[PDB]
Design a binder for this molecule. Structure first.
Ligand SMILES: O=S(=O)(NCc1ccccn1)c1ccc(Br)c2ccccc12
Ligand SMILES: O=S(=O)(NCc1ccccn1)c1cccc2ccccc12
Ligand SMILES: [Cl-]
Ligand code: NA
Lengths: 177, 169
C-alpha cells in the first residue's frame, strides 16, 4: 500500500493518464504496486506489447502480425489458458510513450463477456536519498454487464490486474537481484 | 536454500510421495513464510475456510454440524471467470502434531480428475529468528490443465504468505 508521500507524488499523473470519462453502465479501477527496482528496467518489461506473458498470468500464447511494428494501432491476439472462461482476446495498442513511460491497450474483440475493456499503465521513479524504487499504476474501465450478478466478472478482472502486478514486481525484482 | 532442502527430505518421503497411475503426474512446491509455524499451520488447517488463504473462492460450504475429521467434505464454488465451476473436496489427512493436511477432489464440474493434494508446515529457527517453510504437492490425471493447477497452487501459496506475514506483524 502506497505511502501518503507516494500518493501525493502520483496525484498529477493519476489525473493525466488514469482519469476516465465514463459511460452510463461502466466502471473504473486503479491499482498500485511498489517495486524495489529501477524504473527503466520495469518499463522495458511493461512496454513489450507483443509479450505480456512475461508479467501476466494465464497467458497460453500471444501472437501478432508478421510484419509487426509495435506502434500504436497494432494488435495482438491473446490466447488464454483453458481453465479460464475466456478464450481469445484481440487487443489493440492505444498508447506507448517511452518518454513518459505510459502504455495502454483496448480490447476490440474475442469470445468473452467483458465489453469495451480499456486499461492504462504508467511507471514512476522514486529517488529517496540512498535508494530508488518504482511504483506502477494500472487503471482500467469496463462496461457493467447485463445479466444476473451470478455472472459478473468485474471482480475477476480486478484480481487479475492485481495478480499480474505482483508477478511484474517479482519478475522485475529478480532482474536487479 | 540448500540447507532448508536437507531437512525436508524426510517429510517429502512420508507425505509428498505418490504412487502414480499411468497418465498422472506429481508436483512439489515450496514457500518461505516469515511468521511462526503455528500461525501458518493454524491457517492452513482450517478446512472449512480455504478462502482465507486461496484465490478465487466464491463460496465454501461445509455443513452445520461440521466436525473437522478426515472424511468430511466441503463444497466450493469458484469465482466466476473460471471454467470449472464447483468442486467437492474431502479431507484426507489431518495431523496437528506433525502439521499435515490434505484433501482430494471427489466431485465437481470440471476436468481435474483425481486431483489430490498434501501440505506441510515446517519450522526454521536461525540466528534468533524463526520462520516457516510450507510444502505443497499434488497429483492429477493428465489426458493444457496441469499448467493451470500449478499456477493456482503457486498463487495460493503466495497468498498464504501474505496473509500470515500480515498477521504476525
Ligand atoms: O476448488 S478449489 O478450492 N480446489 C483447490 C485447488 C487448489 C489448486 C488447484 C486446484 N484446486 C479451487 C480453488 C481455486 C481454483 Br481456480 C479452483 C479451480 C478449479 C477447481 C478448484 C479450485
Ligand atoms: O486476455 S488477457 O490477457 N487480457 C488482459 C486483461 C487483464 C485483466 C482483465 C481483462 N483483460 C486476459 C488475461 C486473464 C484474464 C482475462 C479475462 C478476460 C479477457 C482477457 C484476459
Ligand atoms: Cl503463469
Ligand atoms: Na465464468
Amino acid at each position: 500500500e502506497l505511502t501518503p508521500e507516494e500518493r501525493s507524488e502520483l496525484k498529477n499523473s493519476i489525473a493525466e493518464f488514469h482519469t476516465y470519462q465514463l459511460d452510463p453502465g461502466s466502471c473504473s479501477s486503479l491499482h498500485a504496486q511498489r517495486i524495489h527496482a529501477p524504473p527503466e528496467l520495469v518499463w522495458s518489461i511493461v512496454r513489450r506489447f507483443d509479450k505480456p506473458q512475461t508479467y501476466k498470468h494465464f497467458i497460453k500464447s500471444c501472437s501478432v502480425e508478421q510484419n509487426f511494428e509495435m506502434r500504436v494501432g497494432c494488435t495482438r491476439d491473446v490466447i488464454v489458458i483453458s481453465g479460464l472462461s475466456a478464450n481469445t482476446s484481440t487487443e489493440r495498442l492505444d498508447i506507448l510513450d517511452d518518454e513518459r513511460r505510459v502504455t495502454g491497450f483496448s480490447i476490440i474483440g474475442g469470445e468473452h463477456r467483458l465489453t469495451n475493456y480499456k486499461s492504462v499503465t504508467t511507471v514512476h521513479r522514486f529517488e529517496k536519498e540512498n535508494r530508488i524504487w518504482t511504483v506502477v499504476l494500472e487503471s482500467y474501465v469496463v462496461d457493467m454487464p447485463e445479466g444476473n450478478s451470478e455472472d459478473d466478472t468485474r471482480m475477476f478482472a480486478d484480481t487479475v490486474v492485481k495478480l499480474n502486478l505482483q508477478k511484474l514486481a517479482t519478475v522485475a525484482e529478480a532482474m536487479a537481484r
